[PDB]
Specification:
The structure is a homodimer.
Chain A lengths: L13 E3 L8 H8 L4 E4 L5 H4 L2 H15 L4 E5 L10 H6 L16 E2 L3 E2 L6 H17 L4 E4 L2 H5 L3 H5 L1 H22 L4 E9 L4 E2 L9 E4 L10 H16 L3 E7 L7 H5 L2 H10 L2 H10 L4 E6 L27 E3 L2 E5 L3 E6 L5 E5 L1
Parallel strand pairs in A: 1-2, 2-3, 3-6, 6-7, 7-9, 9-10, 10-11
Antiparallel strand pairs in A: 4-5, 7-8, 12-13, 13-14, 14-15
Chain lengths: 354, 350
C-alpha cells in the first residue's frame, strides 16, 4: 500500500500547503507528474474552501485525477489545535478535554494554541475519527501525524507532573494504534519523525503501526553536526532496509525560521538553493533504499521553494549497484547511472552522472 | 543582471539587423525609448562598419547612450560559420561528414564541431570579446534544434553525434565561465512540434530562451501553441527570461506574402496582432517579452508600432485559467481571453 516507488530518477516527495486556494491546473500537473507522494499541509486552500478538510479533499481529487498512483496524505497534528480546520470548532465544544497544567491554566503553545491531552480516551476517539473521515470517507490515502518530539519533550514535565507526562506518552502509543484500527491496513500512517540531536535521538518508532517517518531536520537546527547527520543517514538505511518508508527533508541552504535568510530577494534565495543542493542530495543518495524520498526547499508554504525543480531531479539514476560504503565521515554509493561521494565533516560532496 | 522589467504596458523586446548601416537618430530613439532588451542580428551595419562585431559594438554604444538600461545582445551562432563576422577569417585559419564532403548547410555555410575543444575555446573567446571587452550585455546562442537534430547521426555517426551533443553542453558552460554571472545568455530555443519538442534547457547556465516559431512553421497547431505558452509560463515562474516571437500573419519565407505591398503587409499585420498578443498575455509572467513582426531585417515590420503596445496593462491579478483550448488571464487594466482552436481573441482594455 506504499506509493509506487522507482529508481529512474531521484525519488521525490512533496509536503506543503497553498493557503490562497487549490493548486492551479498547471501547478497540479507539475506536481502530479513528478511524484507519487504528497502531504497537503494545514491551511491548504482555506481561502476558497473555508476549511483544511474541504481544501485537501478537493485537492486530493484533482491530483489523483491527474496521477491515479498519487498517495495524498492528510496533515493532522497529533498535539496542537490548529484553527484552520473544521475540527477546531468541534474541539472547542469539548472543554472537558482541554489540557491543563499543574496550576490549572490551559496548556497553550505561545499562549494561543491549545495542546491535546493524549491520555484522554474520549479525545483520542474524536481525533482518530477526524483522520478516518479524511482517509476512509474521503479521498486521502493516509495521515501525517506531526509533533511527536513536542509531545515527548522533557520540558512538559514541569507543566504536567511526571505522572501525567507518562500518561500522555502512553496516550501517544494508544492514539497511533487507534488511528491504525480506524483507517484500515490499506492506508498510510506517516509521522514526524526521525530526529538526531546531541542529547536525544529518535529512530523509526511504533513500527507495528506506522509506515513512514520524516527526517525533518536533516543537516539543520540541532541536527547539523556530522555525528547527527551520520545517525540520520544510517537510520534511513536501516529503517528502509527493514521495510519502512523514509522521507528525508533537505533544506536549501536556509530555513523559514532564519529571518535574515528569508528577507533575501528571491534571486538570492535561488542562488543559495542551487549552490546548496549537492550536499544533502549526495547524503540522501548515499544511504537511500527502496521507499526513501527526498524533499528539498526552505519551508512548507508552496512559495517556500516547494515547486522549484533542479536538473539533478531529471537525470537518470537507476538501481543501486552496491551498498553504501563508509570510511570515517566519508560515504559513497554506486547507482546504475551515477556515483555518489560525500564527506560529512568537510561538507564536500560529488555526484558523477552518466 | 536581467533587463529592467515593467508591467506598465506590454513588455516588448527587439531582435533584428540593419545591414546597410547603423540605426539613424530617429530609429535609434524609437527602439531605445520602447524597450530595455535588444539582440542585434548578423550583418548589422556591415556596409559602413565592415563586420558584425564592429557594427554591433557601435550600435550598442549609441543605444545605451540613449537608454542606459538597454541590454544589448550580441548574435553569435552556436553552429554556423557566417561570413559577415571578422571571426570568420579566424575560423578559416584553423567538422567532417562520413562521406568526406564538407558539412555545409545548403552547400554554403559550414557547420561547427562542438566536440572539438580548440574550436570551443575560440568560439567562447569571440563571445567574450563582444560582451566583456565590448559594450554588449550578453550573447544570443542560436541554432540549438539544428545541433540536436537526429538526422545529424546520418552525417556524423552515433559516436560523433553524441560527442557534439556533449560539446553543446560544454560550450554553454564555457561561455558562462568566460563572460561571468552578470552577463545574459539567451538561446534559441523553446520549440514545440507534433513529433519533437524542446522546453527550457541547460538552465544551470542560461538566462533566456526564445520561442521563435510561435503559432507558425511546424508549431501552428493548437497542441503546439499550448505547449509553447505553458512552457513560457513555467520557465518564467522558475525565474527565467522568455522571449515569444510572434509573427504578423506571415513570415519572411512566404514568397507570395513578401511580394505584397507595404500597405497590404501593414493591414495584415494589424489584423493579425490580437491573437498572438493574447496568447502571450494569457501566459506571460515577469521577464517575459513579446516580439511582433514578419522577419529579422529592420524593414520586415520590426520598427512598426501598434496602439496595443501603448495601452495600460498593469500587473497580473490572477493566474492563467485554462479550460480545454480556451485561456484567460486578468491584469490590473485588461482582461484577456483566447481560444487556441478557433483563434478567437479578446483583449478587454479598461
Amino acid at each position: 500500500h506504499y506509493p509506487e516507488f522507482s529508481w529512474d530518477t531521484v525519488p521525490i516527495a512533496f509536503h506543503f500547503g497553498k493557503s490562497q486556494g487549490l493548486l492551479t491546473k498547471e501547478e497540479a500537473e507539475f506536481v502530479a507528474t513528478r511524484s507519487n507522494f504528497i502531504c497537503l499541509e494545514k491551511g491548504h486552500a482555506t481561502r476558497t474552501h473555508g476549511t483544511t478538510e474541504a481544501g485537501i479533499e478537493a485537492e486530493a481529487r484533482q491530483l489523483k485525477n491527474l496521477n491515479p498512483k498519487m498517495k495524498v496524505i492528510f496533515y493532522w497534528n497529533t498535539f496542537l489545535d490548529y484553527s484552520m480546520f473544521a475540527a477546531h470548532k468541534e474541539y472547542a465544544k469539548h472543554p472537558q478535554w482541554w489540557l491543563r497544567t499543574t496550576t490549572g491554566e490551559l496548556d497553550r503553545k505561545k499562549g494561543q494554541l491549545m495542546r491535546y491531552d493524549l491520555s484522554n480516551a474520549e479525545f483520542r476517539n474524536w481525533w482518530t475519527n477526524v483522520a478516518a473521515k479524511a482517509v476512509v470517507d474521503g479521498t486521502c490515502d493516509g495521515v501525517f501525524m506531526d509533533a511527536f518530539p513536542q509531545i515527548a519533550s522533557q520540558a512538559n514535565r514541569k507543566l504536567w507532573g511526571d505522572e501525567k507526562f507518562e500518561a500522555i506518552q502512553q496516550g501517544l502509543q494508544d492514539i497511533i494504534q487507534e488511528t491504525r484500527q480506524k483507517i484500515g491496513d490499506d492506508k498510510l500512517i506517516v509521522y514526524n519523525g526521525i530526529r538526531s540531536t546531541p542529547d536525544w535521538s529518535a529512530g523509526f518508532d511504533f513500527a507495528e503501526y506506522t509506515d513512514a517517518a520524516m527526517i525533518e531536520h536533516f543537516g539543520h537546527f540541532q541536527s547539523a553536526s556530522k555525528e547527527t547527520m551520520l545517525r540520520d543517514i544510517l537510520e534511513m538505511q536501516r529503517a528502509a532496509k527493514a521495510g519502512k518508508i523514509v522521507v528525508l527533508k533537505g533544506w536549501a541552504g536556509f530555513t523559514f525560521i532564519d529571518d535574515q535568510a528569508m528577507r533575501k530577494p528571491l534571486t538570492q534565495k535561488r542562488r543559495v538553493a542551487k549552490d546548496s543542493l549537492k550536499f544533502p542530495l549526495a547524503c540522501f543518495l548515499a544511504g537511500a533504499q527502496e521507499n526513501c524520498y527526498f524533499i528539498y526547499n526552505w519551508g512548507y508554504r508552496m512559495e517556500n521553494g516547494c515547486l522549484e525543480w533542479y536538473p539533478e531531479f531529471d537525470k537518470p539514476l537507476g538501481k543501486p549497484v552496491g551498498e553504501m560504503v563508509r570510511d570515517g565521515w566519508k560515504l559513497s554509493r554506486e547507482y546504475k547511472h551515477a556515483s555518489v561521494r560525500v564527506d560529512l565533516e568537510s561538507k564536500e560532496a560529488e555526484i558523477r552522472w552518466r
